[PDB]
Ligand SMILES: Nc1nc2c(c(=O)[nH]1)N[C@H]1C(S)=C(S)[C@@H](COP(=O)(O)O)O[C@H]1N2
Ligand code: MOO
Ligand code: MOO
Ligand code: MOO
């Protein structure tokens with residue numbers, strides 16, 4: 218009867234622990250959200266023993282997206298960070314770059330001075346400790362995220378690069394950032410003709426012209442990859458996207474998998490998917506499986522007895538739904554140095570227009586014709602610390618901050634123990650469709 222908020226985002230995470238898919242409408246099913254063929258945690262990566270592989274084991278799973286376009290599923294994993302990792306490589310000790318300048322990490326220039334002392338002083342200043350010329354991969358990734366951020370900041374303040382950048386699609390934007398990271402903003406701003414052809418979408422002409430530059434001559438193999446990316450607008454020069462059919466042949470094997478200790482089947486999605494995931498993670502042999510509706514689902518009441526005996530899920534942790542408010546997220550953000558997005562907490566329904574943590578008090582919600590019933594709070598873990606853009610798991614922000622102020626009340630410590638509360642689990646009371654913009658009504 219009374220409105221307590223509005224749906225602001227809906228997210229489906231088709232493969233467990235991988236990138237969310239934002240949607241404007243979704244059907245609410247007893248097992249979670251569905252948008253056509255994409256259903257929430259209906260796909261799972263497993264190892265050779267059949268055990269789940271989650272972002273706890275492989276934080277780079279958050280980089281992988283499974284999306285659907287009509288007919289075909291696409292698996293894709295590339296973004297600017299991964300593109301530059303491939304092009305810049307990784308060195309944990311000070312080395313000289315190809316122009317003789319001291320550098321470290323992922324292409325991080327320390328100084329143009331010939332003094333190794335100046336390079337070490339710059340390294341200790343940048344990392345904040347006495348490194349003795351050596352860093353950890355985590356520290357290289359920290360410098361790298363700062364360096365990419367600085368390159369995009371630079372493009373957006375540059376009058377010659379900004380209009381090109383803004384005209385480019387998301388993949389070709391990454392090729393322009395890649396150039397700026399390598400050669401700096403002034404250098405890239407100098408390619409007057411190639412920049413013109415890019416802004417005009419004359420991709421073959423721009424590819425031909427950029428291959429005549431001095432850049433190409435100095436690093437032709439890297440230039441050829443950035444060029445292909447501008448020519449095609451695809452990731453064919455890097456981890457190329459894999460296109461699979463929506464329907465998996467029923468001749469493919471059904472595996473007995475284990476998710477959070479409980480058994481569940483999944484139909485193997487085929488060798489191309491397995492090789493693609495394994496290659497990208499550089500891991501032991503993994504497979505991708507998909508839950509089909511005739512398989513026995515997992516039972517949340519076996520995981521937490523507050524759930525009803527009839528509740529069912531495929532591969533999610535515990536619940537068919539997680540709901541979070543924008544208010545709760547803006548709150549945590551007013552306490553954090555590095556800001557986080559709803560994506561860190563993996564909610565399916567994000568609700569705006571309410572007071573902080575209002576969702577903890579919402580026992581029964583009507584959204585459209587969908588009714589949802591609150592079961593319990595979502596208690597948080599290290600998965601919240603995996604950065605969704607870089608795939609790097611941090612040292613516990615934002616978990617530590619959550620820990621400081623969002624613990625469960627002693628009167629309640631048997632479900633949650635100590636693990637901070639951020640988001641609420643819900644189940645379905647009536648099926649239907651929900652849309653971004655739907656008012657949310659608190660019932661009873
Ligand atoms: N639908 C749903 N969303 C959820 C949960 C859940 O059990 N069900 N658990 C949450 C927790 S605590 C975590 S760590 C992440 C795990 O996401 P994954 O299952 O895709 O790895 O989903 C979050 N959102
Ligand atoms: O092989 Mo290195 O230069 O320690 O990363
Ligand atoms: O003007 Mo260039 O430097 O032919 O792109
Ligand atoms: O951005 Mo384009 O001209 O459709 O390939």
Ligand code: MOO
Pocket residue numbers: 435436437438439440
């Ligand atoms: O960075 Mo390369 O392999 O010289 O083109």
